From Swiss-Prot, chains A, B, C, D, E, F:
This is Microtubule-associated protein tau. The chain holds residues 621 to 697 of 758 of the full protein. The record marks 8, 14, 18, 28, 37, 40, 67, 72 as: Not glycated. Phosphorylation at serine and threonine residues in S-P or T-P motifs by proline-directed protein kinases (PDPK1, CDK1, CDK5, GSK3, MAPK) (only 2-3 sites per protein in interphase, seven-fold increase in mitosis, and in the form associated with paired helical filaments (PHF-tau)), and at serine residues in K-X-G-S motifs by MAP/microtubule affinity-regulating kinase (MARK1, MARK2, MARK3 or MARK4), causing detachment from microtubules, and their disassembly. Phosphorylation decreases with age. Polyubiquitinated. Requires functional TRAF6 and may provoke SQSTM1-dependent degradation by the proteasome. PHF-tau can be modified by three different forms of polyubiquitination. 'Lys-48'-linked polyubiquitination is the major form, 'Lys-6'-linked and 'Lys-11'-linked polyubiquitination also occur. Interacts with MARK1, MARK2, MARK3 and MARK4. Interacts with PSMC2 through SQSTM1. Interacts with SQSTM1 when polyubiquitinated. Interacts with FKBP4. Binds to CSNK1D. Interacts with SGK1. Interacts with PIN1. Interacts with LRRK2. Interacts with LRP1, leading to endocytosis; this interaction is reduced in the presence of LRPAP1/RAP. It comes from Homo sapiens (Human). Glycans are attached at residues 44, 50, 66. It is linked to In Alzheimer disease, the neuronal cytoskeleton in the brain is progressively disrupted and replaced by tangles of paired helical filaments (PHF) and straight filaments, mainly composed of hyperphosphorylated forms of TAU (PHF-TAU or AD P-TAU). O-GlcNAcylation is greatly reduced in Alzheimer disease brain cerebral cortex leading to an increase in TAU/MAPT phosphorylations. Frontotemporal dementia 1: A form of dementia characterized by pathologic finding of frontotemporal lobar degeneration, presenile dementia with behavioral changes, deterioration of cognitive capacities and loss of memory. In some cases, parkinsonian symptoms are prominent. Neuropathological changes include frontotemporal atrophy often associated with atrophy of the basal ganglia, substantia nigra, amygdala. In most cases, protein tau deposits are found in glial cells and/or neurons. There is a cross-link at residues 8, 14, 18, 28, 40, 44, 50, 66, 72 (Glycyl lysine isopeptide (Lys-Gly) (interchain with G-Cter in ubiquitin)). Expressed in neurons. Isoform PNS-tau is expressed in the peripheral nervous system while the others are expressed in the central nervous system. It comes from the Eukaryota. Changing residue 34 to M: In FTD1; ultrastructural and biochemical characteristics indistinguishable from Alzheimer disease; accelerates aggregation of tau into filaments. Changing residue 2 to N: In FTD1; minimal parkinsonism; very early age of onset. The modification Phosphoserine is found at residues 2, 21, 49, 53.
Length: 77, 77, 77, 77, 77, 77
């Protein structure tokens, strides 16, 4: 008996974002009101929690581009 | 018996973000009001918590670009 | 019996962010009001907590670019 | 000829405000956003103006009572 | 000819404000945002102006009481 | 001819403010943001102006009481 595996995922992918001018951006908010009333909080194993938040975000990238690329290979004899 | 594995994921991927000018960005907020009333907080094993927050963010990258790239290989005889 | 493994993930990936001028950025906030009322906090094993925060961020990188790249290889006979 | 005038407005008026306890008063506002854009302002002769205001008032008198009382007498021969 | 005038406005008016306890007063505001953009301001003759204001007031008199009382007499022969 | 005037406005007015305890007063504000942009300001003859102000007031009199009382008499022959 004999097993043989080859793995050659060749790739050449271009992500582009040609852009002129981003111009005038106004993020002008009049902050409201948040109330949270809890008693008990038991968190375990990869918990991500957000409890009571008033957050403002001006995310202005001059071109934002993500390439995600995973290669998995599991061998079980 | 004989097992043989080759692993050659070849890649050449370009991420680009040509940009002129980012211009005028105004992030002008009038901060609100946050109240949290808790009693007990038991956290364990990779907990990420945010309790009561009033946060303002001007994230202006002059071109932001992420390439994520994972290569995994698990061999089980 | 004989096992043989080769591992040659060759790569040449370019991340670029050509940019003119970042211009005028104004982050002008009128700070609000945060109240947190807790009693007990038991944290254990890789806890990240933020309790009661009023934070302001002007993150203006002149081009910010991240490349994440992990290579994993687990062999089990 | 002869003119004669008498003026005797007699009065005894009581204003009262018997009160126990004023208790818990909460004035908890999350301040908003006011913008005024003008060019020219010509004011004359007993002008009272308020231009662009974000004001908060906790007026808690422990009994507030006003008595206004005017006596006018104009004689024209 | 003969003119005769008498002026005897007699008065005995009591203003009262019996009160126990003023208690807990909370004036807790998260300050907002005011912008005024003008060019020209010509004021004359008893002008009262307020241009761009963010003001907070806790007026807690332990009993506030006003009595206004005017007596006018104009004689024209 | 003969003119005769008498002026005897007799008065005995009491203002009172009996009070126990003023208690707990909290004036806790998170200061906002005021911007005024003007060019020209020509004021004349009893002008009262307030331009751009962020003011906080805890006025807690232990009983505040005003009596205003004017007596006017104009004679024109």
């Amino acid at each position: 008996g004999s097993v043989q595996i080859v793995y050659k995922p060749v790739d050449l992918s271009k992500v582009t974002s040609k852009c002129g001018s981003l111009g005038n951006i106004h993020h002008k908010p009049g902050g409201g009101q948040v109330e949270v009333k809890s008693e008990k909080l038991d968190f375990k194993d990869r918990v991500q929690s957000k409890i009571g938040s008033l957050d403002n975000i001006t995310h202005v990238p001059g071109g934002g581009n993500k390439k995600i690329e995973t290669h998995k290979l599991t061998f079980r004899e």
